[PDB]
RNA sequence: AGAACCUUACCUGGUCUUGACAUCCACGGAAGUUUUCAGAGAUGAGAAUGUGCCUUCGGGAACCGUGAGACAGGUGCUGCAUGGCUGUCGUCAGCUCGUGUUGUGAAAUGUUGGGUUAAGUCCCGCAACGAGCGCAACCCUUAUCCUUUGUUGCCAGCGGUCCGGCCGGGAACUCAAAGGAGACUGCCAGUGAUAAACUGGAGGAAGGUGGGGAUGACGUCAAGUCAUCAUGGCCCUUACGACCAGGGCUACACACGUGCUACAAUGGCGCAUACAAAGAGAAGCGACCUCGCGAGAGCAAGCGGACCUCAUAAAGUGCGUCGUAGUCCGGAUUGGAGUCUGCAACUCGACUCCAUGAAGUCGGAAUCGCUAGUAAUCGUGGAUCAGAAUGCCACGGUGAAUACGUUCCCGGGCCUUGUACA
């Protein structure tokens, strides 16, 4: 309706870049080209593996793929499953002879995609949102997370012209810039209707 | 005539590109002209928003890349030889001038 | 030299070389008319039909596809 | 995007410089003011289907033609969405 | 935020049907490389050409090639199916909840009074206490300092000067980016309930959110994009397809939605002083030059970018011209030289030497627009860019007219009246 993306205004503010490489003019369009074919591809295997973010910097003809996760025991595989296999991709189709860096951020029900994609995993399970929202709001209210704002998109229950949702809770001061909001929309492909989700999480003043 | 050039987006990343060199690569044997980022190459793009007519976007973005022109003149055998192995830290390319 | 194209230079060398004959449905209309093209007929593709032009020696500053345009007005 | 243009994308981009990176040097004197003959003009357009003035600079990762950008190699809504995901490094909203 | 083709979603001339391209296997060819041929090019007669690499030589990487199939493909339909994005009311100040009690309840009280502010901003009275969304400030910016420390940029001071920072030197004048101050009605006086708010004073570059940006609550709007991807549902699949030459989207014969040039108390002219920021660049910017009647040809250093190039310019002045006359204002209309661009412009490329010298003497009814470096009036780049700026997006200079007011109108809203209208 009438908004700005709460990351896009705050990358110039204390919320940092979730990818930051550098180059010059001619290769300036071919580098984030390579950075896109890994970010569409790391979703394709690390989907159930509790994916959080993907960070890419270019120190010298290499990318430091700094994967942030919360369930790393399934990410590693058979202790060597995903060391060179996920450096095999970046060598040619990204053109980057690079290394891999997996790392866990804890609290696996508090990151933006995690609160988002769990409800999708509960709506791919097709449980009642009226039982799903009311608990998955308070998972954030359990482990801290000073404020939440969760809108579930329509085509919910039996309807073809549906409504929106809210559960506003705590405090979500996104109109004030100094509020480091871990926001990430997701999408859940229930058969009738694209049931989407918008998740605002406030991780403390700075 | 070891003339150091680094291009970086931030100031808060290019500012610790000189702490790498002022102490650990200069004690006496590098006649430092100065870490001086003097110009800035700003690039603004008032690209649209809506996938239709909008008649006024109010979307525009910018970059402020800085250009440190660091011209040290003392090719020592102590200071400037602990220097060829330095690309710190994030998105760092070389335009050393000789 | 003057603006001719091989899309009609493989037509005007099959037209002028053997005298005056049946015409060529000429796809490349934008050319410049040689002085030995007088009397000869080289058509103009308007989008559907290679409509021809009665070649006149006044077509020095003037060009080919004026008498055979695409569009009609009344 | 006219998804069949992603077929005709490479067909109009690749062979443009795979034919006219070196063959333009092969005739780079004649039609230029250096002397004018038709054998180079026969060399010029004995095929047609190679054209380095046919590339419309289609977008990179989804291919929308309009609103393309020179520096970024991306178009109208994709420059936005990559800047909102942080996919573009060092790029905030312009304000001064 | 851009049409010869492409874009093209549009039409056909030519046509390509396991295809343009991919999943999938078969079976051979290493792919690939030169060339004739014939075409409008696809397609196609093809010959040549090589047989590299994994190779534990059976097979292959991977395409070249068809045969065969699930079926590749459709800028294709309702944003009135919805995802995401989005116009507007609207920078408006509004919008509801947990507890509390009035009431049998639907519901109110919270939100209502005194006023006061840009404002649910704030205080006194509050039938409430409380909070979250929103106005605010956080932020970018410039209006003025110190410190930073001298390139590609400057010369106060001191000098070598072949006045050019040219060369010492000096970080200085100042320019150029990192990072601190200061501003809070602060202070006093006065207003007002002694409340906040405010009226003057002082100070400074800055005083009554320093100023502009940036930032759009619940939402009503079957409104925007099913043609960007996405997309519940429908669909043409030898095809709302694919595949090539080529044409048009630029006919006007004109109504009008918005602009620039004019109609002149200075325009065709020629002349000499003066100085800007903002920035542009290796499929480059392109100078010094030589040169084009101009358009433009050759020479093209340097900069790879405060070096070099792009490009230092305008009203401003010193001078007359010339008299508010359709020309000596104006600029049209009709024709063609000389190159530039692009294979490609005649239809549908502009710049340009010269003559051609229209309509127009400020435009009716009226409308739209705007409060200080302001309406405007002249300079300066950027992109869309093979070559198409009047505009678009940003920067320089000169500098206005002023504000009684809510009568009406627009745009409202809030606080309080009456209807058999969901």
Nucleotide nearest to D59 (CA to C1'): E228
Contact D42 C7 (CB under 8 A): no
**Would residue D93 count as lying in a domain?**
no
Helix (H, G, I), strand (E, B) or coil at A22: coil
Residue of D nearest to B50 (CA): D77
**C27 within 8 A of C57, measured Cβ to Cβ:** no
Report residue A54 as tokens: 């993907």
**Which residues in chain C, range 10-39, keep a C-beta under 7 Å from any nucleic strand E atom?**
10-11, 14, 24-25, 27-30
Report residue C21 as tokens: 């004959």
User: At what resolution in Å was this solved?
Assistant: 3.8
| Helices vs. strands in chain A: H and E counts, helices first | 4, 7
Residue of B nearest to A64 (CA): B90
In chain E, which nucleotides are within 7 Å of a protein Cβ?
1-2, 4-9, 11-13, 20-21, 39-42, 73-76, 81-90, 131-142, 148-152, 176-179, 212-219, 221-222, 224-225, 228-233, 241-249, 251-253, 279-280, 282-283, 297-298, 305-307, 335-337, 339-340, 342-348, 383-386, 393-394
Give me the CATH number covering residue D21: 1.10.287.1480
Neighbouring-strand partners of residue A53: A68
**A112 within 8 A of A199, measured Cβ to Cβ:** yes
Nucleotide nearest to D46 (CA to C1'): E41
Query: What span, in angstroms and rounded, lies between the C-alpha atoms of D31 and D26?
Result: 12
Sort strands B64-72 and B2-8 into parallel, antiparallel or unpaired: antiparallel
The runs of H, that is alpha helices, within A75-152 are: 85-92, 112-124, 129-142
Q: Are A115 and A199 in a shared domain?
A: yes
**Which of B88, B95, B83 has its CA nearest to residue B16?**
B88
**Which residues in chain D, range 19-38, keep a C-beta under 7 Å from any nucleic strand E atom?**
20-21, 32-34
Report residue A44 as tokens: 């394709």
Q: How many residues does chain B have?
A: 98
Q: Cα torsion at C33, C38, C41, C47 (round to 10°)?
A: 30
Domain boundary among A106, A138, A157: A106
Specify the DSSP element, H or E, that contains A28. helix A28-39
Helix (H, G, I), strand (E, B) or coil at D7: helix
**Would residue A91 count as lying in a domain?**
yes
**All residues at 6 or more sequence positions from B59 whose CB lies less than 8 Å from its CB, including other chains:** B46, B47, B48, B49, D80, D93
Specify the DSSP element, H or E, that contains D76. helix D76-84
Q: Are A61 and A48 in a shared domain?
A: yes
Sort strands C44-45 and C50-51 into parallel, antiparallel or unpaired: antiparallel
**Backbone φ, ψ for residue A21 (5° rounding):** -105, 170
Domains of chain C: 1-74 (3.30.860.10)
**A103 within 8 A of A52, measured Cβ to Cβ:** no
Q: A170 is in which domain, residue-wise?
A: 107-206
Tally of CB atoms within 10 A around B1: 9
Asked whether strand E has any atom less than 7 Å from the CB of D61, the reply is no
Domains contained in chain A, number: 2
Specify the DSSP element, H or E, that contains C33. none
Helix (H, G, I), strand (E, B) or coil at B49: coil
């Amino acid at each position: 309706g009438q908004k700005v993306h709460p990351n896009g205004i705050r990358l110039g503010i204390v919320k940092p870049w979730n990818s930051t490489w550098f180059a010059n003019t001619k290769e300036f369009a071919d580098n984030l080209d390579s950075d896109f074919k890994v970010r569409q591809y790391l979703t394709k295997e690390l989907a159930k593996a509790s994916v959080s973010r993907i960070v890419i910097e270019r120190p010298a003809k290499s990318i430091r793929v700094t994967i942030h996760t919360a369930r790393p025991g399934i990410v590693i595989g058979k202790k060597g499953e995903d060391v060179e296999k996920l450096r095999k991709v970046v060598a040619d189709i990204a053109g980057v002879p690079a290394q891999i860096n997996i790392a866990e951020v804890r609290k696996p029900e508090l990151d933006a995609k995690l609160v988002a994609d769990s409800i999708t995993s509960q709506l791919e399970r097709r449980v009642m949102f009226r039982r799903a929202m009311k608990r998955a709001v308070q998972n954030a209210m359990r482990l801290g997370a000073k404020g939440i704002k969760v809108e579930v998109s329509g085509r919910l229950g039996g309807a073809e012209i549906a409504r929106t949702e809210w559960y506003r809770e705590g405090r979500v001061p996104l109109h004030t810039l100094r509020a480091d909001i871990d926001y990430n929309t997701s999408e859940a492909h229930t058969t009738y209707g694209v049931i989407g989700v918008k998740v605002w999480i406030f991780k403390g003043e700075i | 005539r070891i003339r150091i050039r680094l291009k970086a987006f931030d100031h808060r990343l290019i500012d610790q590109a000189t702490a790498e060199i002022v102490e650990t690569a200069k004690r006496t044997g590098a006649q430092v002209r100065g870490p001086i980022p003097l110009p800035t190459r700003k690039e603004r793009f008032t690209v649209l928003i809506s996938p239709h007519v909008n008649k006024d976007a109010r979307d525009q973005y910018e970059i402020r890349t800085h250009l440190r022109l660091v011209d040290i003149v003392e090719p020592t055998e102590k200071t400037v030889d602990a220097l060829m192995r330095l690309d710190l830290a994030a998105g760092v390319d070389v335009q050393i001038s000789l | 030299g003057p603006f001719i194209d091989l899309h009609l230079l493989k037509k005007v060398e099959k037209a002028v070389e053997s005298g005056d004959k049946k015409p060529l449905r000429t796809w490349s209309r934008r050319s410049t008319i040689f002085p030995n093209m007088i009397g000869l007929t080289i058509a103009v593709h308007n989008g559907r039909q290679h409509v021809p032009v009665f070649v006149t020696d006044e077509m020095v500053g003037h060009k080919l596809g004026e008498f055979a345009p695409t569009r009609t007005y009344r | 995007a006219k998804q069949s243009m992603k077929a005709r994308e490479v067909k109009r981009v690749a062979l443009a410089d795979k034919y006219f990176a070196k063959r333009a040097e092969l005739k780079a004197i004649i039609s230029d003011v250096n002397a004018r003959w038709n054998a180079v003009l026969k060399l010029q357009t004995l095929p047609r289907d190679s054209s380095p003035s046919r590339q419309r600079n289609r977008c990179r990762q989804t291919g929308r033609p309009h609103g393309f950008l020179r520096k970024f190699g991306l178009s109208r809504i994709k420059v936005r969405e990559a800047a909102m995901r942080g996919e573009i490094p060092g790029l905030k909203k312009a304000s001064w």
